[PDB]
Amino acid sequence: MIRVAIGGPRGKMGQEAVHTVMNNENMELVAVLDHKDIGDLLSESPNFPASYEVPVFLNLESLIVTIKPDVFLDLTTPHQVFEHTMLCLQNNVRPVIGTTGFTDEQLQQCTILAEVNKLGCIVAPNFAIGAVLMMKFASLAAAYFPDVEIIEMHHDQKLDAPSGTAYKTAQMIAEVRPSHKQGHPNEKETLEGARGASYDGIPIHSVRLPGLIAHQQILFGGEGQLFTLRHDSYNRQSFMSGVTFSINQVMEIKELVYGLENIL
Amino acid sequence: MIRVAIGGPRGKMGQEAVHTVMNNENMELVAVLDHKDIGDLLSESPNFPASYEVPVFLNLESLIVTIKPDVFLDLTTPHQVFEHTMLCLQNNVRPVIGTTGFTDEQLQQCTILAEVNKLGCIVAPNFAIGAVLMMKFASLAAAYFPDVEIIEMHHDQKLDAPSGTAYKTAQMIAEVRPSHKQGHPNEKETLEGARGASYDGIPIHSVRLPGLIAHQQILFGGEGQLFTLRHDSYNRQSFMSGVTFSINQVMEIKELVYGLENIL
Amino acid sequence: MIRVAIGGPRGKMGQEAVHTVMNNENMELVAVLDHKDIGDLLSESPNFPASYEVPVFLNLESLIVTIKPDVFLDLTTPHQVFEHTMLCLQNNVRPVIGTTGFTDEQLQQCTILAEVNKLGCIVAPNFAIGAVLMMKFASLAAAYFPDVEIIEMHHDQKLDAPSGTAYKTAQMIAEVRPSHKQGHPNEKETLEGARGASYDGIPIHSVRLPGLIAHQQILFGGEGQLFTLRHDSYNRQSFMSGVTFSINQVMEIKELVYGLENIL
Amino acid sequence: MIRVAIGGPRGKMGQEAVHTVMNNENMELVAVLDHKDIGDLLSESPNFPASYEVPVFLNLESLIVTIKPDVFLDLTTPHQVFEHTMLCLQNNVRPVIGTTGFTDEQLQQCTILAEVNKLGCIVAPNFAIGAVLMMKFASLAAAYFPDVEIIEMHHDQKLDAPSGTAYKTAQMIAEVRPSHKQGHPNEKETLEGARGASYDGIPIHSVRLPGLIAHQQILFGGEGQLFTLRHDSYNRQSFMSGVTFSINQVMEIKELVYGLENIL
C-alpha cells in the first residue's frame, strides 16, 4: 500500500491526480498541501473539500510529521520544488515532482542526498507515458532513419510555437541523429515559412486549430518507407498513467531519476 | 468507341496515358504525335515502338487529316498547347490538354472557337481525381469550417515549397473562406518558421522526406471536432482516372471547360 | 434575431445546445420545455435554473401561446417528436428536430403540413456538420472511386458495432456505388473476422478503445492513389455548428427537409 | 570492406538487394548463386547479366571455394536455407538468411555450429527496419497500454488476411500484454465481423484496396490518450536498410541471431 500526499490539489493537474490516487487500488490519499490567494472568494474558488481522511496542510513540514506519507507528489510551482524535495529526502518521504524546475546546483544537491539516504525521487517534466515513449522510441529509431520531421498540433489559444514537447523531442533525437539539414540543397520557399522551423536540421511544424487539444507526430523517412510515431492527448487524464507509474516506481528505486524516459 | 491520339507518348505522364488508353475497353489508341531531340542516342532514348496500329506523326496537321481522331490528348509542353488546341478545334477533334499553359488571350480564343463549333475541350492542370476532389470538397467545407490548415508532403528531391497543388488548394479555399489569420493574436514563434507559410491567412506546411511521393492533408478545425481530407499519390497512375474521365466527358460537352473541378 | 425555445435542456445534447443558443449573437433563448422524473432527488438531478429570461414549461402548447418562439429545437425523445412537430407547424413555429424518430406516415403528415403553411422544418438525425459532410462527400466520391472501406473508432463502452454513423455512411455510398464485393475473389481469412463486416460489399471495421471518443475514416482506393475523408469528434460541441446552421436555415426555407446532407 | 555473394539475384527481393549491395560504399558484390528453370525462354526470363566482377555459380560449394566471400545473403527458398547455412558456417562465411524457413532441429544445428566457430549468422524473416521497430516498440509499449488494436492495409490482390506481419506483431505484443478481451462485455455486432479478428484478445482488422501496398498501424488506447505506431512500405526498397544492417552486423557478432528485433 502506498500512502500519498499531494501538493497543489486544486490545480489542473492536481485535480486529476487526486482522482487517480483515490481510484488506484494500492494507493491511499492521506493529505494535501494547499493554500489559496488571500483575495480568492470562496464563491469563485472553493476550498479543497474538508474530510477526515484527507486533511489539508499549509506547510509541508507539518504535513510530514503528522501524516508521515510514503510519497509526496508535488504539483505546485517551480519556485517551491527544491525546498520541498530536500525536506522530503531528509524525512524518509519519496518525492515525485511534476515540474519544469530545478537549477543545476539544486538538482545536484537533491541527487546526492537521495543517493546517500538510499531513497527514491522521480522528477518528471512530462508525466504522459505516450508522449514520453514517443520521444524515447524516436531517439532509438533515429539511429536507423536519420531523416525525420516533427508535426505538432494544438488548440488555437496556445501562445508558443513550437511546443515544449516538440523542442524536447527534437533535443532527444539530436542526441542520436547526426547533425544535418534535410530537403534538396537547392530547394527554395516561394511562400516564406513553408518548410517550418529547424532544430539541428530537424524540421518542426506547428498547427493551431480550434477543436485540437495536444497532438504530435514524428515522421521518419527512408527509401521506400515511412515510419511514424504519434501521440494524441484529449484531456489531462493523459498524464495520469505516468503519475501512477512514478508513485509505484519511486518506492522501488534508491536514487533520483530525472525524466521518465530513464525508467520506462 | 473513342479513337484517341496522344501527344508526347514518351513523357512520364505520356507513358502512363498510352497504357491507360490501350487498356480502356471503349478507347483505341490510333496515333501519336512525337519527336526526339536531334542528339538522342537510340541506345539511351528509344523511339516510340513501331506498329501498324499506332503510327507516329511529327506534326499534328498531318496526324489529324490521316487518322481523324475523335480526341487528341496533349501531354506536350506549354509552348505548344495553344496552336495544338486551335488546330483540333477547327478540325472537329476534341482536345484534352494536360498543361500549366495558355495565356488569358489564348484561352479566350480557344473558348470562343469551341463554343461556336459546339465542340468539347477540357484543359486539366491536374488530372488526379483524388486531388481535384480534395480541393473541390475543401472549398465547399470552408463555408462551414473557416479555420483550416494545409500540410503537403513530398519526396526530398522537390525544389519548390509549397507545392503547386497546395497553392491551388489555398486559392480555391480562399474563394469561399473569409480572409482571416489564425492562431492566438499574441502567439510568437520561438524557432523561426514553426507556424509555416500563410496564403490569405491559411497556414501551409511542407514536409520533404525520402520515401514519400506526393501527399496532402487539409485539416478543418471547429469546436469539438476535426474534419480532414487527404490525398496520397504513390505513382503516376494516380492521374489516369482523370485522363479516362476527361476523354469520356469531352465527347459529351459542347464548350471548353478549364479545370476538372468544374465537371466532376 | 431568432427567438429559440429548447426542448430537453438538461440532456447531454440539450446542455450543449443551451450554451450554443445563448452564445450565438443572433439568437435568444426564450424558454425551455422540461420536466423531471417524479423520483429525481434535486440533490442528484437539479432543476433547470430559474430565470426571468428563460421560463420553464411542462407542455409545448403552453410554451407556444405564452412565448411565441420563432424556432423550437426538439432534443426530447422519439416518442414525442411527431406531436411536437405537428403542434409547431400549426402554430407558426419552425421546428428543428434532433431525432432518430418518425414513422413514414408521421413524417408524411409533417411534410404536407409544412408545405401548405409555407413553414420550414428541419429533421436532423446527425447535427455534426463534419460527419454529415464526410458522408455527403463520400457519396459524391464513390462515383469515381467505387472501392471503399469504412473504419470507425469509438470508446470501449459502446455497445453496438458498427456505429449508426457507419451504417448511414455505407447506405449513402451505396446509393451511388455499384454493388460489388472487394478483395481478391480467392482471399481467405485465417483468423475469422479479419476482413470486417460488409454492407452491400463495403467493408466496415469497428475499433473500441479507451481514450477514443467518436471517429470515422472513409478510405477510397484506386490505381496509384488513396483518397481519405475523416471526422474526429472529441466532445458534444461537435454537434453544435449543425444546431446553429439548422436554426438559421429553418427560417429561410418553406418546406420540411429531412437530413442535413440535403441542405449543406 | 565486406565482400558479399547473393543467392537468388533475379527474385523480387534479390534484384533490390543486388542494387543495394552494389551501391553501399563498404560492400562489393563478388558473386551470385543462381539458376533458371529448364523451360525459361531467355526472351521472357533473361539470365543474370554476365560480368567479370560478378560471376554466376550454380552451386554454393563452388562459389565459396572460388570467391571466399565474407557474407552470403540467401534470398532463395525455404527448402534450401538449411543446407546453405550449414555450408557457410563450416567454411568461414557469415550467412544472412531472408526466409520464413528452418525447422526447430535445423535451426538448433545452425545455432550450435555458429557458436562453436565464433561466426555470426543472422536469420531475418522481416528485413524492413520500420516494420521490425514497429513491432519491437509495440511490445515495449504494451507494458503500459494493455488495450491495443492492429489495422493492416494491403493491395487488393493479397490472398491472406490477416497479414503475416500482423500475426507476428500480435504474437510479439502477447509476450508482454496480459491476456484479455477488449470492448464492452455486452457489445454485440449487428453486422457480422465488424469487430475484426482476435489474437489473444487483440483485435486485428484487414483493409484491401487498389492503390495500397503494405501498411500497418498499431493503436494503443488509455485514459485520455492514443499512442500509435505506423509503418508504410511503398516498394521493396523498404527492406533494404535491414539487408544493409544485417550484412554490417553479421561481421561483428559471433553467434546466430534469429529476428532483427533481437539486434536493432
Numbering used by the authors:
A (entry chain A), B (entry chain A), C (entry chain A), D (entry chain A): 1 to 264
Please quote the authors directly.
DHDP reductase (DHDPR; dapB) is a branching enzyme associated with two described pathways and that reduces DHDP to tetrahydroDPA using NAD(P)H as a cofactor. To address these issues, we determined the structure and characterized the biochemical properties of DHDPR from the psychrophilic bacterium Paenisporosarcina sp. TG-14 (PaDHDPR) isolated from sediment-laden, stratified basal ice from Taylor glacier, McMurdo dry valley, Antarctica29. The results of isothermal titration calorimetry (ITC) and enzyme activity assays demonstrated that PaDHDPR has a strong preference for NADPH as a cofactor.
PaDHDPR tetramerization was observed by analytical centrifugation and through generation of a crystallographic symmetry mate. DynDom analysis of PaDHDPR structures show distinct N- and C-terminal domains linked by two hinge regions (residues 129–133 and 233–235), with a 32.3° rotation angle and 2.1-Å translational movement. The N-terminal domain (residues 1–127 and 235–264) responsible for cofactor binding comprised a parallel six-stranded β-sheet surrounded by six α-helices. The C-terminal domain (residues 128–234) responsible for substrate binding and tetramer formation included a five-stranded β-sheet and two α-helices. In the tetramer, each C-terminal domain formed a central 20-stranded β-barrel structure surrounded by eight α-helices. In the apo form, this loop region shows a relatively high B-factor as compared with other regions.
